[PDB]
Structure 1
């Protein structure tokens, strides 16, 4: 593996390893003045297109592109299916720029064939808070793959981010690239055991018959934290303090403003669910997860896998095991087939006791133009969508 594009970028080489005492950009003293003002060149017959994610039809174009062409599991049985409403929520956070929502259309058909996006946030890395772009939803149409279009998207968004005097980015991928700061396996907790078997997500054996697997995964419809309820506006100050205080321990975390806590946590049906425990006017516990269905490719019975992805979970009145058991319950009450989590923060500590299964791969975390020590994923305290 040669990394002919990645080698030219301010990111570590495959073999670089830095001490905890290094925590700085690869390239500093950057000047907005010097950034190229011209758009990167596309191949003949393709054009940059500014996507207006707040316009239903533009948002729908992105939706269709990703639905057809976005990330599949290692075996090509599932494809991520972010909803249009999810996209809206994901891309219009506080201080977002419409111009970091970058499509490429094929001129002859006026069809969107490429996409990349970023939103700005404060990122704390080894106790240094830096303004960064959070990049996501890079996608080239399946019929246009391995044509070196992705580097053009990446260079173009880097240029536009740099124009705002931002010089660092954070991103995740399942692929290995120069060079992860941390690497987090994913795990799955079955809710609807029978569906998961029928679609090949999960497995049975002579010792685990269907009826026993169903019994293994059954959950009691009663919360450990009795008063856990959907978050409301009035809980924003309390979540900001609970979640903020919690995150300061990790090597890698977003430093949320109150405005960002409202945007990121206030519940939206089929998008984001946040539950809180309020005691004496204080928010003492919180659970949150987001909805990311997967399209099931060619299963005769089921087209969609409804899945909850653990976002941020904090307890002060219960055990973390108890809190995450409540999170599984709340996901079941909301019709999800499965609860997914990565081995970040304290999550790994509860996976065995709560009957999570190890998945088949891992999610790599990346920083652009930042040089530091890598670390085990328990020290990661940010979950990207």
Structure 2
């Protein structure tokens, strides 16, 4: 059962979501006035704390908690080690609400014990295309389009309870207090992703990995020698040959994005994301925030020829602590972010992505099969991983969609 999730306004089973035909709210319509003004109760030995995610030392504290206690792969070989600069970037986009950053500490000694973060996002989340066609067949076009306008909602990420405090029903409390603070801002939906199955995803995608430094990955046990590489005299030399990349990008006029590219990159990205059922809508301020280059955090390259931006790609860095190997401290992973191609095939664009990432010392390039990411898997030699990313809404009925109809990248 789900003692917590059964009480929440989300579809409860796969069967329920097979049935949903229109996008819309699950819950009782409510007002800010209905929502408690005071934080949710918690044990006297704890307190709620709102870190200042633009203060270096508050960023450091959250950084430590995540470094030591956040997501691990299924065999606890790797643990995400999001950097402090990455955390300030992800948690402080334009018009972020400091209150949506919710921490728990031990009252006595201010020991940091748990965290959960909300940030705003304007998301297109109306009835997906395939369901609108059915709606129109049935004369229900109006019901189907009702919630088509981009909504100002909450994106939740970074939920983390300290390893000492697991299975004490703390996470429900964080979710409740997060829900309260968001409702008090008059926001009633949230979108979240997780690598675990909860009630109930609207989309689910596999993870894909493209080795950049195969000898290191094999050492740290990220990959391993496919027993078909045992056919060969020298498995390692063949593996390096298979994954070798150009040492310089191949598209003429590739360069890093600059501030004056903002409007053009906004246009081409928004034209592209508009073709997906679920996807974010970005102002210029959000385009500069989420895509302008930031050392060690986000890297974005544009194709410009005849000074017109016709193509761009972006990736962001999340290192992972290598928990089982002491020879290497870190796995240096690059994560495919947003992109758009109008002048060249997408595999040709993302090949440059791989070249840059390799060139900058990244060990592997990861992504989920959202967007048009499947369109370059084979030719660029990405392999499916163990993981799946599951997409969820809070308080929003949504029909099942393919991951290739999801245009929202989560950090």
1:313 counterpart (334, 339, 347):
339
* Per-residue deviation, residues 124-151 of structure 1 (Å, max 9, x unmatched): 0134411110101000000000000000
> Once the 2 structures are TM-superposed, how far is the Cα of residue 38 of structure 1 from its aligned partner?
1.4
* Per-residue deviation, residues 141-192 of structure 1 (Å, max 9, x unmatched): 0000000000000000100000111000011001100100100100100000
**5 Å matches for 1:1-385?**
2-14=1-13, 15-18=15-18, 21-27=21-27, 29-126=29-126, 127-204=148-225, 205=227, 206-207=230-231, 209-385=235-411
Conserved in 1, the CA contact under 8 Å of 2:248 and 2:356? no
Tell me, in whole angstroms, the C-alpha distance in 2 between the residues paired with 1:254 and 1:142: 33
Conserved in 1, the CA contact under 8 Å of 2:20 and 2:397? no
Q: TM-score, normalised by structure 2?
A: 0.91
* Per-residue deviation, residues 290-332 of structure 1 (Å, max 9, x unmatched): 0000000031210100000000121111111111111111111
Q: TM-score, normalised by structure 1?
A: 0.97
* Per-residue deviation, residues 73-125 of structure 1 (Å, max 9, x unmatched): 01111000000000000111011011111110012221111101111110101
Q: What's the secondary structure of 1:310's corresponding residue?
A: strand
Conserved in 2, the CA contact under 8 Å of 1:224 and 1:323? no
Q: Where do 5+ consecutive residues of structure 2 fail to align? A: 127-147
What is the count of residue pairs matched by the alignment?
384
Conserved in 2, the CA contact under 8 Å of 1:19 and 1:372? no
Tell me, in whole angstroms, the C-alpha distance in 2 between the residues paired with 1:279 and 1:226: 8
Q: Answer with 367-376 or 280-289: which moved more.
A: 280-289
Q: Where do 5+ consecutive residues of structure 1 fail to align? A: none
Tell me, in whole angstroms, the C-alpha distance in 1 between the residues paired with 2:180 and 2:358: 43
